[PDB]
Design a protein around this ligand. Sequence first.
Ligand SMILES: [Mn+2]
Ligand SMILES: [Mn+2]
Lengths: 198, 198
Amino acid sequence: AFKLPNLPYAYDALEPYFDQRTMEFHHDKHHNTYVTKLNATVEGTELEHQSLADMIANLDKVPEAMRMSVRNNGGGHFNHSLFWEILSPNSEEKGGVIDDIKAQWGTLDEFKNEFANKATTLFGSGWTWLVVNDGKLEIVTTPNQDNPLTEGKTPILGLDVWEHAYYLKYQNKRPDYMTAFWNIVNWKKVDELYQAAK
Amino acid sequence: AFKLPNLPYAYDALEPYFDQRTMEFHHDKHHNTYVTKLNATVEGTELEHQSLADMIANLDKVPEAMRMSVRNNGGGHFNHSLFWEILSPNSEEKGGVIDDIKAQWGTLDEFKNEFANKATTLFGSGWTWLVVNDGKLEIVTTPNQDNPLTEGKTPILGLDVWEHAYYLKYQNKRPDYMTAFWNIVNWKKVDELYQAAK
Ligand SMILES: [Mn+2]
Ligand SMILES: [Mn+2]
């Protein structure tokens, strides 16, 4: 069975950028529901002992009757698992991945502007991602709980733009949420993920 | 230019079911934004003196460069304008459409439980609808701001299950929002739309 992972920090650790109350609902209700629903689908099938990364990467090979749930709930589990790990109260904008972002976009500020633009124009529920695509960095969005790993691109950083991720503190002001996020990116983790994928 | 319609009741008239604060954000910010962006797309073009119902019904004919915005923002305008009219602070479960629902589903609770089932399983952002399809009643969902009118089906009742519609009061408890909604349906207005499309 898949398990709801504990946060690596306290529910208040990301204040005043991401509110405690949201972290509680987001982790303990939303993420938990994805885990329970994924387990409901894979319990007593061949997928039970398959890794989450493998099934998301190989979504096409999941049998048709299970595929929507693995996509949606397995995506939910995978995406939120990654999300919590790339947030940190000790954000420092340095590391190999930061150097290579600057090489490609010219500056970190130009990177953030493209990221923000894509995050703010995403229509409906979804995610904005920094991915590695055949050695190169790219910013892409996905709808709902779709993940770029399914398309062969390795995600190293993501922003959840489902309204549950920001509505309590920010209501419709998604751009203010985006602004807040930069203060709490775990660039050490993103770098670790980048060094492995490049 | 398209105009944001006023609510046909006070912002607190749907309490204790839909909270005043959310009525404010939802109408004054979210609906307003859809009207604005629709106008930015349509103003000074061939679309200017075309009815919104016609554009939604015939979305595949909207010129390619404008179509996503008419779909998303036009859909948002159409859907929310319908939504406000089918709410009431003085709901009564009576009318021709109610009688036909009872005849088709057996009881009104059976209808509501089907509706609620479809609303609670809608993954991501979207709407749950009662439609008329070639004279018959049917419950269907749409993603994002898509509308059944685009597939030849006339909507007579809709529930918004975008998280902005319920997150401030209900957070993750979409089923509790659904239960609330039934107390504030304007069945007279639904009945009017039903008789026009039947
Ligand atoms: Mn989320
Ligand atoms: Mn809405």
